[PDB]
Ligand binder design. Sequence first.
Ligand code: HEM
Length: 153
Amino acid sequence: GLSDGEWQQVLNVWGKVEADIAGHGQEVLIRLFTGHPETLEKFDEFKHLKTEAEMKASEDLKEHGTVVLTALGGILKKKGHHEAELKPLAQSHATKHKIPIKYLEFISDAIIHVLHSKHPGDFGADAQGAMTKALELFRNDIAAKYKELGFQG
Ligand code: HEM
């Protein structure tokens, strides 16, 4: 867990994202897909967008980025009391999309990268500490449900 002070740093940084969720969303997906090409293959509707420039030219990709960060923001705002929002996501990523936990690790690092990239010098050490914790929490709770389901990957 996170202290209230850590949660207040998480939500304060999330406010920066909300200034433009789609722009942040697109950056996260691109970092993921260029950094770990294997992840693109799980998306049937984007697997043909193998380079950064192709990825940038798709509003469909950008609306998916929007969906991803609006879901995440909604989870962060629960401050760890997220059992109800997390179970459906774990189940669908495990059973429908077949997303190994490693990919969640990847997107987690991608978010940190993007925050530093879009707000250089504005994402403090303290802020980073708290955001990291928050994503680890998220990952760890998804991990528990994967285990329940035996999604070996
Ligand atoms: C911050 C972590 C993530 C969040 C919040 C998230 C959220 C979502 C949401 C809300 C949906 C739509 C509803 C559903 O199908 O459950 C979805 C679908 C999907 N997710 Fe994720 N996701 C995350 C990570 C990932 C990663 C790392 C991958 C793959 C490398 C992935 C692959 C997919 C795919 C393939 C679908 C179906 C897509 C489509 O129909 O275009 N997700 N995700």
